[PDB]
C-alpha cells in the first residue's frame, strides 16, 4: 500500500464506489496469475470475444493480465492473418477514420502501441491506411497514427518500398501546397518521422542504399523555395532538413559500412541553397555536416568531382564568412560578384564608404550579424571593458570609428586587449564560438581547419 | 493605439514580400523571354539556380536594412525598437530546438533496442510453444463443485448468524 500511491489507490477504491452510478478446459478469463497461466497452459483456451480483451490492490486485477492477453494469443495461436487481435485493431481503426467511433483518442493509443510491434500487422495498417484517400478523411489521425508506427517499422520487401513512399510523400507535399496553408505542415512532421525510420534502414546492413536514396529524394522537397523561402521561412522545413542532414552526419561517422560516393555528398543544388539562406542553426548544421563530410574527404582522391564540389563549398564559405575577398572570386554561391556591386545600387547604406565589405563577414551577414552583436556584448562583459562598441552591427567602419576618438587611450586599456584590427575582432568573435557554450560553435570550429591563422587562434 | 497600425504592417509586410518575390519571378523570366521571344522552358536546375540567386537577394536586402537600423542603433524609429525584440527572439529560441532534435534520436534508439529485445523474446516464445505438448466428461466433478459451493456458502452464512467464535475459510 505504498505511500506515494495512496492517493491513486484511494482514488481507484473511490472510483469503484463512484462509477456504480456516476470442465477439463480453462478459460483465459478465469486465470488469476502468471504462475497459474504457466501451470494450466495445456488446459487454457481463449474465449472468442475479441472486444473484451483489447480494451479495459491485493486481489487480482485482470487488467494486469489483459496486458499479456494480446501477446499470449499471438503465441498460443501462431501470429497470422487469422489471429483475432488483427481484426479488432483494424476494425476500430476503420471506425476511427470514419468518425463512427465515440472517442478515437481513446482507441488510437491502444492501436499505435500494439501496431508498433507485429511488423506484419504494422505493414497491413501501412498498406491499407498510408494513402492519400485516408489523408482526405482525417489528416490528424493519420499523421498521429502513421507517425507513431512508422519510426519502428521494417520493410520485409526492399523492392517498390521507396517508390511507394516517394509517391505517397509527394502527394502530401502537394496536399499542403494545394491548401497553401503553412499550418498544413503535415509534410514536415511526416518528413521528420520517416527520416527517424530511415535511421533503422541505414542501421540495417542491407536496404541501406534504399535509405540513402529516399533521404536525398526527400531532401529535394524540403529545399524547394515555396516550402522554405528565405523571406517566408517557416521553421518546420528547417528543423526537418537539419534532422535529415543530421542523419548523414551519423552515417558519415558510421562509415565502417561502405557507401557509394553518389548520395554521400548532399550535392551543390542543396548546399548553394542552404548557403543562400541565413538561418544560423541551418548554417550550423551545414558546417556540422561538412566536418562530418570532411571525415570522409581524405578517403577519396582530391581530383574527384565529389571532392571538387565540396572543396568549392568550404572555399566560398570561408571567403563569404571570414576571408572577405569575395569580389575577386569567380562567383559567390554560383552568382557573379558584378551583381553585388550592382545590387547595392538602390540599396541605401548609412556608411556607403564601405558598401561591399559589410556583407562579406559574419558581423554583417544578416542573422549572423545580430549574433555577432550578442557575441561582442558578452566579450565586452567578460573583458569588463569600460569602452563599448558604439554601433549595434559590427563591421570595419563601426569598429574603427570609435577607436580613432579613443585611440590615444585604447593603447593602454579600456577595450578588448585581444584585438587591434577588425580581423582580430572577427577572430575574437569566433574565439567565443570556439567552445561548447554556443549552439552555433560549429561554424567557427569547422572553418578553423582551413584558415591557418584561425586554427592557431583556436 | 499604435499597435493597430503595427499589426496592419505585420500583415502588409507578408503581403509586400510575397508580392516582391513573385515580382522577381516575373522580372527574371520576363527579361529571359525578352532575349528570346519564347524562352518559357527554363530548366529545373536553371530554375533552381535562379531561386538560389533570389534567396541570396533576400540575404542582401534584409542585410541592407539590418545595417540601416543597427549601424546607428539610435532607437529613433519606434519600429526599430520592435525589430530589436523581433531579432532577439529569433536567435534566443534556437537552443531548445537543437537540443530536443538531438535527444529524440537517442529516445528512438531506446525504442529500437526495446523492439529488438522483444522480437528475440517472441522468437523464443514461438519456438518453445511449438515444442510444447498440445492442449487437452467433467459431469461428476462439476456436481462435486456444486456440492462444495452449497456446503461452504451455507456454513459461511449460518456460522455468522450463529455467532460462531472463529469465522474461517470453509474449504
Amino acid at each position: 500500500f505504498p505511500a506515494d500511491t495512496v492517493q491513486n489507490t484511494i482514488d481507484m477504491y473511490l472510483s469503484e464506489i463512484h462509477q456504480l452510478g456516476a470442465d477439463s478446459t480453462v478459460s483465459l478469463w478465469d486465470v488469476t496469475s502468471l504462475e497459474q497461466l504457466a501451470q494450466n497452459w495445456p488446459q487454457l483456451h481463449i474465449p472468442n470475444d475479441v472486444d473484451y480483451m483489447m480494451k479495459p490492490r491485493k486481489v487480482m486485477s485482470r487488467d494486469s493480465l489483459k496486458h499479456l492477453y494480446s501477446s499470449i494469443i499471438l503465441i498460443k495461436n501462431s501470429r497470422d492473418e487469422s489471429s483475432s487481435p488483427y481484426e479488432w485493431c483494424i476494425w476500430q481503426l476503420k471506425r476511427c477514420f470514419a468518425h463512427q467511433i465515440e472517442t478515437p483518442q481513446e482507441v488510437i493509443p491502444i492501436i499505435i502501441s500494439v501496431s508498433s510491434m507485429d511488423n506484419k500487422l504494422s505493414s497491413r495498417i501501412i498498406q491499407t491506411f498510408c494513402n492519400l484517400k485516408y489523408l482526405k478523411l482525417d489528416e490528424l489521425t493519420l499523421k498521429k497514427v502513421c507517425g507513431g508506427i512508422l519510426p519502428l517499422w521494417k520493410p520485409e520487401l526492399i523492392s517498390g518500398t521507396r517508390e511507394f513512399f516517394v509517391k505517397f510523400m509527394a502527394s502530401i507535399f502537394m496536399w499542403s501546397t494545394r491548401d497553401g496553408h503553412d499550418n498544413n505542415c503535415t509534410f514536415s512532421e511526416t518528413c521528420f518521422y520517416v527520416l527517424q525510420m530511415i535511421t533503422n534502414w541505414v542501421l540495417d546492413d542491407k536496404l541501406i542504399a534504399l535509405g540513402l536514396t529516399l533521404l536525398h529524394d526527400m531532401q529535394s522537397l524540403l529545399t524547394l523555395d515555396k516550402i522554405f523561402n528565405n523571406a517566408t521561412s517557416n521553421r518546420f522545413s528547417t528543423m526537418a532538413f537539419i534532422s535529415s542532414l543530421d542523419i548523414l552526419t551519423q552515417l558519415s561517422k558510421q562509415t565502417k559500412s561502405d557507401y557509394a560516393i553518389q548520395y554521400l555528398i548532399v550535392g551543390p543544388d542543396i548546399m548553394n541553397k542552404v548557403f543562400s539562406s541565413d538561418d544560423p542553426l541551418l548554417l550550423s548544421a551545414a558546417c556540422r555536416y561538412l566536418v562530418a563530410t570532411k571525415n570522409k574527404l581524405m578517403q577519396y582522391p582530391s581530383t574527384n568531382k565529389f571532392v571538387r564540389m565540396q572543396n568549392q563549398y568550404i572555399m566560398d564559405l570561408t571567403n563569404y564568412l571570414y576571408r572577405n575577398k569575395v569580389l575577386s572570386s569567380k562567383s559567390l554561391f554560383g552568382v557573379s560578384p558584378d551583381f553585388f556591386k550592382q545590387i547595392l545600387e538602390n540599396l541605401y547604406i548609412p556608411t556607403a564608404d564601405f558598401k561591399n565589405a559589410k556583407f562579406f563577414t559574419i558581423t554583417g551577414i544578416p542573422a549572423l550579424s545580430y549574433i555577432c552583436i550578442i557575441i561582442l556584448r558578452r566579450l565586452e562583459t567578460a573583458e569588463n571593458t569600460k569602452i563599448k562598441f558604439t554601433s549595434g552591427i559590427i563591421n570595419e567602419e563601426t569598429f574603427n570609428n570609435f577607436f580613432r576618438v579613443h585611440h590615444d587611450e585604447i593603447g593602454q586599456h579600456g577595450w578588448i586587449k585581444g584585438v587591434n584590427n577588425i580581423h582580430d575582432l572577427r577572430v575574437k568573435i569566433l574565439m567565443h564560438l570556439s567552445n561548447t557554450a554556443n549552439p552555433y560553435r560549429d561554424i567557427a570550429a569547422f572553418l578553423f581547419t582551413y584558415l591557418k591563422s584561425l586554427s592557431k587562434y583556436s | 493605439s499604435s499597435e493597430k497600425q503595427w499589426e496592419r504592417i505585420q500583415q502588409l509586410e507578408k503581403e509586400h514580400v510575397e508580392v516582391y518575390r513573385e515580382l522577381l519571378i516575373t522580372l527574371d523570366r520576363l527579361y529571359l523571354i525578352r532575349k528570346h521571344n519564347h524562352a518559357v522552358i527554363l530548366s529545373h536546375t536553371q530554375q533552381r539556380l535562379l531561386e538560389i540567386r533570389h534567396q541570396l537577394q533576400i540575404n542582401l536586402e534584409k542585410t541592407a536594412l539590418l545595417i540601416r537600423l543597427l549601424e546607428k542603433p539610435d532607437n529613433t524609429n519606434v519600429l526599430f525598437t520592435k525589430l530589436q525584440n523581433l531579432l532577439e527572439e529569433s536567435n534566443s529560441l534556437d537552443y531548445e530546438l537543437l537540443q530536443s532534435l538531438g535527444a529524440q534520436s537517442s529516445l528512438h534508439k531506446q525504442l529500437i533496442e526495446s523492439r529488438a529485445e522483444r522480437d528475440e523474446l517472441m522468437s523464443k516464445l514461438i519456438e518453445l510453444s511449438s515444442k510444447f505438448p498440445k492442449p487437452t466428461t467433467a459431469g461428476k466433478q462439476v456436481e462435486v463443485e456444486k456440492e462444495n459451493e452449497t456446503i461452504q456458502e451455507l456454513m459461511i452464512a449460518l456460522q455468522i448468524h450463529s455467532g460462531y467464535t472463529n469465522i474461517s475459510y470453509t474449504i
Binding site: 516517394v166 507535399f173 502537394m174 501546397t177 524547394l224 523555395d225 | 529545373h44 530554375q47
Partner: peptide, 15 residues
C-alpha cells in the same frame, strides 16, 4: 531510380 527525380521535378515544375 531517376523516375523519382522526374516526379520530383514535376512537383518542382508545379511550384
Amino acid at each position: 531510380n531517376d523516375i523519382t527525380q522526374d516526379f520530383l521535378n514535376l512537383i518542382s515544375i508545379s511550384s
